[PDB]
Amino acid sequence: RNGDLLLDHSGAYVAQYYITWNELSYDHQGKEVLTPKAWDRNGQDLTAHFTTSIPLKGNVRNLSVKIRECTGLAWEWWRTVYEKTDLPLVRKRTISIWGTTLYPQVEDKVEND
């Protein structure tokens, strides 16, 4: 079950993503293994306008998407703008964020029709 995770950041604030998942695999004895995987830009400070597409394989399990907005300097405050765990692996999911620092907004769009 191929899938794509599209992210769009148009908000007037610094955002951070934390996207992790497991890949299902079988060893030379053929029993189950879940391999932790993560987006390479996890924890990176991102500012508008930013877009990306993350390809997700059919053996992907335990998809977790965490989106935070940040503030402060040397040390940062954060509050969660979006957070879902064990997201259904669908054909195409688009998560878009926008708005202001004090009023961040988010849309999660699923397409698996």
Numbering used by the authors: 359 to 471
Paper text:
The cholesterol-dependent cytolysin (CDC), pneumolysin is a virulence factor of the human pathogen Streptococcus pneumoniae (pneumococcus)2, the leading cause of bacterial pneumonia and a major agent of meningitis and septicaemia as well as debilitating diseases such as otitis media, septic arthritis, keratitis and sinusitis. Once bound to the membrane, monomers then oligomerise to form a pre-pore complex that subsequently undergoes a complex set of structural transitions to form a transmembrane pore, typically comprising 30–50 subunits.
Crystal of the membrane-binding domain were grown at room temperature and contained two molecules in the asymmetric unit. By contrast, the loop is partially folded back in the structure of domain 4 alone, and fully bent back against the body of domain 4 in the previously determined structure of perfringolysin O12. Together the structures are consistent with previous suggestion that the loop springs outwards and downwards when the toxin binds to the membrane of a mammalian cell. In the crystal structure, Glu434 not only forms a salt bridge with Arg399 but also interacts with Arg437 that in turn forms part of the binding interface by packing against the adjacent monomer. Interestingly, these interactions are only possible when the tryptophan-rich loop is flipped outwards in the putative membrane-binding conformation. When the loop is folded back, as in the domain 4 structure or in the structure of perfringolysin O, Glu434 no longer contacts Arg399 or Arg437.
